[PDB]
């Protein structure tokens, strides 16, 4: 742990600095150091963690897609043989992506999830576990692809069950988890109908609970509801 000698509060301070500087790899390294101090994360600290890794893996995913599309093109009838470089470099980016996902899942498994007893922390980490298995599923093509998909599904499902029992239908974590699990169905599990039904039911139950909110909670909730509707528009 290169971050072993830095104060927990100093790691969190530098995480926020790296965020402002758009240095998300640094941000991620600082938050991994913080998690490895062994203490539970507060709400704000969990969000620093997810923000850091979302941006790192988000750039890796965008590169991987660019390289996949090139590689698939060099495989069309009538493409000129280019040698192994496109596949090699796609594999390099792909390996590095998987290593980031393995790092995040390692943090959840040692020991974020097992200590998370409040709904807000447990659902948040289970959502993350589903997301990072989903990112692994997007590049999976092997013996393990089914089990990686089922790992995503299983994490999302446990997070759904707790969120339905313990949080109001407008809770932003509950909404974001539903949004992502609905994308999992559409994009990964080949179940566009489940994806549609989940996004529609989530949207409509949140709608009917907006009346209970303050104006700031209303903003946070309708922001994510709009993403559900944008997906529905995309899919229908």
């Amino acid at each position: 742990g290169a971050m072993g000698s830095m104060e927990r509060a100093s790691l969190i301070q530098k995480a926020k600095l790296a965020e402002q500087a758009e240095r998300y790899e640094d941000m991620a390294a600082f938050m991994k150091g913080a998690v490895e101090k062994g203490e539970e994360l507060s709400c704000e600290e969990r969000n620093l963690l997810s923000v850091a890794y979302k941006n790192v893996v988000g750039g890796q995913r965008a590169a991987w897609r660019v390289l996949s599309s090139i590689e698939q093109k060099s495989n069309e009838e009538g493409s000129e043989e280019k040698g192994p470089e496109v596949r090699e470099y796609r594999e390099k980016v792909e390996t590095e992506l998987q290593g980031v996902c393995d790092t995040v899942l390692g943090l959840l498994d040692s020991h974020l999830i097992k200590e998370a007893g409040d709904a807000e922390s447990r659902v948040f980490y289970l959502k993350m576990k589903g997301d990072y298995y989903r990112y692994l599923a997007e590049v999976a093509t092997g013996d393990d692809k089914k089990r990686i998909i089922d790992s995503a599904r299983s994490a999302y499902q446990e997070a759904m069950d707790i969120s339905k029992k313990e949080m109001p239908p407008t809770n932003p974590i509950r909404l974001g988890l539903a949004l992502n699990f609905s994308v999992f169905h559409y994009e990964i599990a080949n179940s566009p109908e489940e994806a549609i039904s989940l996004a529609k039911t989530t949207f409509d139950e949140a709608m009917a609970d907006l009346h209970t909110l303050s104006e700031d909670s209303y903003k946070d909730s309708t922001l994510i509801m709009q993403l559900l509707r944008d997906n529905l528009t995309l899919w229908t």
């Binding site: 997301d131 949004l179 994009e187 994510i224 993403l227 997906n231 995309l234």
Partner: peptide, 5 residues
């Protein structure tokens, strides 16, 4: 691509 958070 569809939206995720």
């Amino acid at each position: 691509f569809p939206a995720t958070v």
